[PDB]
């Protein structure tokens, strides 16, 4: 197969961080078998955003991961019907986010319906003060917990002033079709970068590379 070597990506995100409402559109392309995707984002409502764009970026699809023969590829096996994921982001100073994405496919295009909710960021903290620089590359640990494919990673935002701001991610992943078989435990190495932006991060180009491995 359903998945082509070059696929298009359409996205809308709605959400709310610390009471601030926003709507963000994405248009992108990627190479599912190479583990590569990029996306052009445009803030449609609520700009300029009063918080660090970086908290959002991992919400803007593990289909775009290079999987070896010897690990079951749950994501590419979910198409054409698709899959959903739910994520919690627990930051070290008490900020919490819940994000979800329902992913479908029509022809050569993935469609993404994303919701992003955050609360409890301190007003003087690096998120609300816009002090973040980038996510460090990391490794997602994939396993099965009570029948549900689960990915954990301890993430780190580099801040100005050479300190890191830590976040624990937990994602659950669910195929829409009954009986897509679950994989065994494995790892996914990943890196996400902002390639370019304008002044207030109303237009942003994003890139991710991800590779599955067994350790």
Numbering used by the authors: 2 to 61, 65 to 219
Question: What text does the study give?
Answer:
The mGeos series of rsFP’s display similar switching behavior to Dronpa. The series was developed from mEos2, with mutations that remove the undesirable irreversible green-to-red photo conversation, increase fluorescence brightness and provide high thermal stability of the off-state. We present high resolution room temperature SFX structures of Skylan-NS in both ‘on’ and meta-stable ‘off’ state collected using two different XFELs, the SPring-8 Angstrom Compact free electron Laser (SACLA), Japan and the Linear Coherent Light Source (LCLS), USA.
The higher resolution datasets, both collected for the off-state after saturating green illumination and were readily phased by molecular replacement with 10.02 and 9.27 sigma solutions. Similarly, both off-state structures were seen to have trans chromophore conformations with full occupancy, giving no indication for the presence of on-state with cis conformation in conventional and omit difference maps. Considering that optical measurements also showed negligible bleaching with full conversion, the off-state crystal structures are found to represent the pure photoisomerisation product and not a mixture of photo products. In this off-state the chromophore phenol ring has been repositioned to include an indirect hydrogen bonding via an ordered water to the carboxylate of glutamate-144. In the off-state of Skylan-NS, the hydrogen bonding distances are 2.4 Å and 2.6 Å between the phenolic oxygen and water, and water and carboxylate respectively. The Arg-66 side chain also displays a translation/extension motion where the direct hydrogen bonding between the guanidinium group and the oxygen of the chromophores’ imidazolic base can been disrupted and Arg-66 has been pulled “below” the chromophore by it binding to Glu-144 and the newly displaced His-194, resulting in a total movement of 2.6 Å towards His-194.
